[PDB]
Design a protein around this ligand. Sequence first.
Ligand SMILES: Nc1ncnc2c1ncn2[C@@H]1O[C@H](CSCC[C@H](N)C(=O)O)[C@@H](O)[C@H]1O
Ligand SMILES: Nc1ncnc2c1ncn2[C@@H]1O[C@H](CSCC[C@H](N)C(=O)O)[C@@H](O)[C@H]1O
Lengths: 347, 343
Amino acid sequence: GYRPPDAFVNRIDRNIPVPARLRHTPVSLIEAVNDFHYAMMNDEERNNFYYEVLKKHVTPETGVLEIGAGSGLLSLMAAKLGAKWVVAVEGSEELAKLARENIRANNMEHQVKVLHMMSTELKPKHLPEPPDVLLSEIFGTMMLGESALDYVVDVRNRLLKPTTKIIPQFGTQYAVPIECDALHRISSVSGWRDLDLKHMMTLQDTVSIVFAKHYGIRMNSVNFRRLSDPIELFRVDFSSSNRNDISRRKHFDVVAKESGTAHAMLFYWKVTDDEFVMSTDPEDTVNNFPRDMQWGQALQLLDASNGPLPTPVVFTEGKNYNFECNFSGDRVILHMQLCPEEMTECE
Amino acid sequence: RPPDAFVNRIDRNIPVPARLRHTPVSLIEAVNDFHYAMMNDEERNNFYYEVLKKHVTPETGVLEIGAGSGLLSLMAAKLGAKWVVAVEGSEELAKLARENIRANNMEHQVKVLHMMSTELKPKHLPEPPDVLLSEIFGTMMLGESALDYVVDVRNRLLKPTTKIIPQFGTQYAVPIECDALHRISSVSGWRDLDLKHMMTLQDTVSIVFAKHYGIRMNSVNFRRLSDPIELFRVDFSSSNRNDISRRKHFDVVAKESGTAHAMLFYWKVTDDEFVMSTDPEDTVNNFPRDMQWGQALQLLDASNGPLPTPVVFTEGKNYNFECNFSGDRVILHMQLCPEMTEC
Ligand SMILES: Nc1ncnc2c1ncn2[C@@H]1O[C@H](CSCC[C@H](N)C(=O)O)[C@@H](O)[C@H]1O
Ligand SMILES: Nc1ncnc2c1ncn2[C@@H]1O[C@H](CSCC[C@H](N)C(=O)O)[C@@H](O)[C@H]1O
């Protein structure tokens, strides 16, 4: 017999039993589905979001194009609503097949087609015509975390026609300074009785954006306080915006509603199309448990200045606080640095 | 600027404090991901403090495997040990420990060696130690080979009278029903759309840490379908990994009827009267422990069909499970025995 180099069994001790359905299946595909896709599909509210927005844009003469088909659920929705043709693009090989198999298992093998490629190499030749609708779910815990704006923009410039409706329409990344003792106990140490340990603080990570779930935390489960109104880091119109519409450095003047300790900046985002909303805000994901597991929220520990040891950002209600937001080149990573009163070039 | 410097993996536009710029990334990741949480697990710290002060004389020489930050050695020194030698494999962690030791003026009580305990020879020690101190437990108790590393030191460096801390370790397992976990790990479909083919890929083999699902078991609602399954127990002063059979079987009687979505894995460490538990029923107020360890999970498939079959419990009936250990006993797997298995 033969075993693919990336077969699941290869990752597993000889003494441990593996079901035939898993043995020769590629590790990455298994990891992809088990870690993300199962949680995505049980995000009913997410599925309901895309079904409703498609429902008001799909005619039997509607040509649909989806970026990142994965399992093909969204592409199935387009066809389910009676679309003329659906072409779904998927970057990895094994996800491409899995989509097709889901497409045969259901009705739509004639209606929906899945191309193995990145949307970057998708050419007008690969499409029947310019699509009426562009479909996309390529949002991460950070909205542009998996470069959603860049992939749509490339496709928007090359493959779409004027009348093309882009789903979804709007996207906004928010930031909130929060007090959260529970998080603080995971990320800070002073000492144990007589023993001084504050030197450990030399190493505290004030720079990295961190996904709540990866370190075992769900903000809906943890008690915390929002020390201010949401901060609109940036808005994006997917049918007109570019990644340079997001200035690589911005300054935000935040008014503290409540006094407390800003242990961390909490990062969430909302996606809008007409009256329909996709929210990453923990207030809206209380009952959407699968969403907190797929997207969740992101955190960044705040340091007030550049001392040898981190300085706590203490908010005093009514008093005003100034933050410098620095994006990376691809606008995929960002950072919130409190302005002093010389890491920042605040003025 | 070291090749492993923290700045070097950060965008040029993002600001990095001087205390972090030239610091090795691995050190930062380690301290931030684990050490902070360890140090705020005060039950854990209190566990070792109480077991230590029961054995530490001003005549007691202490040897710690895996110093890391070296807090436990600071405890042994604080309790007035005559000499403490703490061994640490990470070069950057070893220096971090030394600094903590200077900050508490115990520079001459505690010595930190940059090596693996495998390389620790009697030459490196003043005397065969009176006390052996270890914290090398993972979310899976033997997940970090805590048993093997102690056995090597036990065979080569210790003396008959050497008290090993901690004494006992028990790896438990419980079959549980958990609707929240099920929604994260399975899919049937969406309305008329059938997505059951997705189930072909459901990972039934891998042991996944609960926090890597993003889950803390104390926050999520679940049912235990039977009494705890003692997979194995180890005496760190006499057991070898060969004492753990490569394959064990278990008569598991269902206390309750339900769906065994998964096998929950926790453990308990014992020394005299003192207990270190990973059971989520004991970590309800120990939020740092659930973050540094938490629990483990394995999804259960009942047989070997083209699709996963739910393991369903009927109260009062028996369910035989086969447990297979990897060679180093670091990894294990629970498989239901049908009326892949040797049963
Ligand atoms: N430029 C790109 N081109 C094609 N596929 C992409 C892509 N970027 C990400 N992807 C793929 O899109 C998927 C993101 S999630 C899958 C969404 C799917 N339509 C659903 O709702 O079920 C991943 O599988 C990823 O491999
Ligand atoms: N055989 C081994 N020998 C020496 N150090 C080890 C080791 N196995 C693991 N370690 C190290 O021990 C540490 C495990 S965690 C440190 C726990 C420490 N007692 C404290 O509470 O601060 C890690 O730094 C690891 O690199």
